[PDB]
Write a structure and sequence with these properties.
aspartic-type endopeptidase activity, 25 strands, monomer, Cathepsin D, subunit A, domain 1, six-stranded mixed beta barrel, about 40% strand, mainly beta, 2 domains, globular, amyloid-beta binding, about 400 residues
Length: about 400
Amino acid sequence: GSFVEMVDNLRGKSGQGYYVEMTVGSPPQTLNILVDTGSSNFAVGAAPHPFLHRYYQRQLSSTYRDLRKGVYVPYTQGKWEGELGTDLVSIPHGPNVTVRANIAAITESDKFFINGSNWEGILGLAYAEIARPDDSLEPFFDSLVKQTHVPNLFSLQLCGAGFPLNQSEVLASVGGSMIIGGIDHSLYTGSLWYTPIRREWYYEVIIVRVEINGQDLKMDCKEYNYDKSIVDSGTTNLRLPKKVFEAAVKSIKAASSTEKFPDGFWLGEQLVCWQAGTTPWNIFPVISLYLMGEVTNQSFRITILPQQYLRPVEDVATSQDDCYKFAISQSSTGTVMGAVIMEGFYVVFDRARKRIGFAVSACHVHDEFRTAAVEGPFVTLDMEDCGYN
């Protein structure tokens, strides 16, 4: 209920990712690792790269083991290739243990590493089912739980600032907490509500209803999970299947019509700027996603504010304007509850009980009039039918 050693162990921001410090090899080589619940490989830069201030030097680790096997991971517009091996790994501000884990040493990449993000590897926290090359490559958390007694679950509190952060500020500020093996009550308020993990590959869940300022989007719920719905800390936006996206955007535009924004804004391509401190949060609606509950015919909802779905971006121009990008975009691979959403809540990945908990985050951004919320219960029927096959 209180793992203060791990509290505030993350840094980063929604657009670049949130990362934790880790050490690999002997002697320890410290690297910043992106916390990604949308993937399952532990991989680190292992060769010079313009965006890497440091990287994994296998030849300098006495405990490095070569698995003599390559691995490839494709991305919409990016990817990385590496060589598999194992080594000793520790998390300085995590449990006091050392485990031997699979490590994909990244030798080639394109549009994977980000300029100034400050992370040098990625920690895939999802299940073996989606690990590359195949499910025989045990994921890090699975090795951690197998080799130690750390409880089988972790929790994440990703803290967005609500304003732009320069390189210096990101480096010198706390981006949140990753509590490994437990739940820390100081990270949230109110109650934790759990939704079932439908299947253990991605952290898949089922959304049963969506509202824009209380108004039911009213679509066949299967559409909300068309393909799948996952919780992904490695994705910046709240991503929605095409039909849902178009309906949601139509409703948000209608709720905000007192002000008009170019199409590029809604396409998440261009920013909208308001003079210092005048962002009209009140004209933008809240969005509630109802999730299947653990109790039969019961559901609960999580509600986010425009302070979560409008991502702050600096206006380099010598202006003091407050600028943002619309952080809801379309997906052809189902719903993704990305960093946008996670910044609003403390999220418990209870692998042990195959469930994900949501509570209002003690660090979510809001104003004096509205706050994110997690509320329940609601009597809802035939939710299983919202699931796609």
